Write a protein that binds this ligand. Structure first.
Ligand SMILES: COCCNC(=O)N1CCN(C(=O)c2ccc(Cl)o2)CC1
Length: 119
């Protein structure tokens, strides 16, 4: 019932994601010099360094907001990919499965703790 615990749980999970080779494409923003059409396709860039900085700045109120930005990393990869068999997109799908496997308990515990708080 700790309604703050999600923040360190997310820091920990971001540390695991940064250790994961599959996060290599989405640590930093897309260099628009290497992908000159990126912003023609993607309205809202997102990456894991931006998510970590937002968290560490105290600019997430809940793990749902962090989850929305991480999911945007993955949806951007899916929107930008020329092929469902692309290397970078394939890395996104594995990393997404990993993230969803790990974030589920963080969301559940937070929502449970908030419900207890508001009982
Ligand atoms: C080392 O990483 C540098 C920053 N990352 C980066 O440039 N990109 C990651 C995002 N992205 C894609 O999701 C994608 C799908 C299919 C193809 Cl190709 O790319 C475009 C490439």
């Amino acid at each position: 019932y700790d309604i703050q615990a999600w923040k360190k749980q997310c820091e920990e999970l971001l540390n695991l994601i940064f250790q994961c080779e599959d996060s290599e494409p989405f640590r930093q923003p897309v260099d628009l010099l290497e992908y000159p059409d990126y912003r023609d396709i993607i309205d809202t860039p997102m990456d894991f360094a931006t998510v970590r900085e937002t968290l560490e700045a105290g600019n997430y109120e809940s793990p749902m907001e962090l989850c929305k930005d991480v999911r945007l990393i993955f949806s951007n990869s899916k929107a930008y990919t020329p092929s469902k068999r692309s290397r970078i997109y394939s890395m996104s799908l594995r990393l997404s499965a990993f993230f969803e496997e790990h974030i589920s308990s963080v969301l559940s515990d937070y929502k449970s703790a908030l419900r207890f708080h508001k009982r």
